[PDB]
Design a binder for this molecule. Structure first.
Ligand SMILES: Nc1ccn([C@H]2CC[C@@H](COP(=O)(O)OP(=O)(O)OP(=O)(O)O)O2)c(=O)n1
Ligand SMILES: [Mg+2]
Ligand SMILES: [Mg+2]
Ligand code: NA
Length: 351
DNA sequence: AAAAA
DNA sequence: TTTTTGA
DNA sequence: AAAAAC
């Protein structure tokens, strides 16, 4: 029998999850450990959830868990409890916990992460209305946008919306850089029907250093002139060819997506979170691999490179510590081949 | 929390 | 037992 | 001067 690897980068994980009863519970337990800053226990529940997502059959008895890695005693007790009556008492207790409920609610606001959510909870806040109306609190520009466009941003992006955004991004980019290669990355590249945002990788084989640097500024100025730019933060590249977010130039946006552009009213438009990444042409395969995800697939790719191959992988490069050389790649397939891994298709990276 | 060193 | 867990 | 954004 074929042995399931402990690494997500050695598993094929499509969106057809036969174990959602177990993985929904494990994702909740992981999220609680993330909040309680218990990184180790968090990661163990994330890995167990990931491996169950790869299974081609549903777990219906404890015998079905034999030989599956990342399922220790604690995880097997959770699976046993769900087999017993269809529910997880552990995940149910987390769903009813006040700290957990407040963290989920507060971090659902764009611009609010773990530190600000924890701060507001310890101050005694429990609702978004009481936070917004408070006269002592001061909000960042990101949080102001997060509250103003809250319902649109919490409703998530569907495929017709992602496709409409892709058309807008591609059309704007090729207007200013005709030879640019625009790729939608993230969940939508992995075949997802929904996402919290729409991510893109932009690269150009012939653009100069100045042209490459100016593209995101030209495209966002163009949208600003049209009143489509609801939020914009451009992070300049800190990329160093000879060697936390990656160092490529990027922008975190909120775009006004007119309903007439969506082929699938109210105010007639929807606020959409969009991320654009510009990378030098020679790093395009590393950037594409890093931005395609999933987060668990990326973690395990890097963990496999370190522990199994004595290599160092990131969104910009692959370094071989034994040969003392950087390994170049023109495609994701070439990165997988450098690592000694069978190629995993993007729609198989939903770890 | 699980697996490796 | 202690170390590692993605950059 | 942290925090947030992946
Ligand atoms: N902690 C993280 C977060 C993100 N990423 C990478 C892989 C995914 C990519 C996009 O980030 P998200 O937009 O948050 O990921 P997603 O897969 O697109 O999921 P969603 O469908 O919710 O946008 O960046 C990662 O490696 N590690
Ligand atoms: Mg995304
Ligand atoms: Mg993103
Ligand atoms: Na948030």
């Amino acid at each position: 029998v074929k042995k399931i690897s402990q690494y997500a980068c050695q598993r094929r994980t499509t969106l057809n999850n036969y174990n959602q009863l177990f993985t929904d519970a494990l994702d909740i337990l992981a999220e609680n450990d993330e909040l309680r800053e218990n990184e180790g226990s968090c990661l163990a529940f994330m890995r167990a959830s990931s491996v169950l997502k790869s299974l081609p059959f549903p777990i219906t008895s404890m015998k079905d868990t034999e030989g599956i890695p990342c399922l220790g005693d604690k995880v097997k007790s959770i699976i046993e409890g769900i087999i017993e009556d269809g529910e997880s008492s552990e995940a149910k207790a987390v769903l009813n916990d006040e700290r957990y409920k407040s963290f989920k609610l507060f971090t659902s606001v764009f611009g609010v992460g773990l530190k600000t959510a924890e701060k507001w909870f310890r101050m005694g806040f429990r609702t978004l209305s009481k936070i917004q109306s408070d006269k002592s609190l001061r909000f960042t520009q990101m949080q102001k946008a997060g509250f103003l466009y809250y319902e649109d941003l919490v409703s998530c992006v569907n495929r017709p919306e992602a496709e409409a955004v892709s058309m807008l991004v591609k059309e704007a980019v090729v207007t200013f850089l005709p030879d640019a290669l625009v790729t939608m990355t993230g969940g939508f590249r992995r075949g997802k029907m929904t996402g919290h945002d729409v991510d893109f990788l932009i690269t150009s084989p012939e653009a100069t250093e100045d042209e490459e640097q100016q593209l995101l500024h030209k495209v966002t100025d163009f949208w600003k002139q049209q009143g489509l730019l609801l939020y914009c933060d451009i992070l300049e590249s800190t990329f160093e060819k000879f060697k936390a977010l990656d160092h490529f130039q990027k922008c975190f946006l909120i775009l006004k997506l007119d309903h007439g552009r969506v082929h699938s009213e109210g105010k007639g438009w929807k606020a959409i979170r969009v991320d654009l990444v510009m990378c030098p042409y020679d790093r395009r395969a590393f950037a594409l691999l890093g931005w395609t995800g999933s987060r668990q697939f990326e973690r395990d790719l890097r963990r496999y490179a370190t522990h199994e191959r004595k290599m160092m992988l990131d969104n910009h490069a692959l370094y071989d510590r034994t040969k003392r050389v950087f390994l170049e790649a023109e495609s994701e397939e070439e990165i997988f081949a450098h690592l000694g891994l069978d190629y995993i298709e993007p729609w198989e990276r939903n770890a």
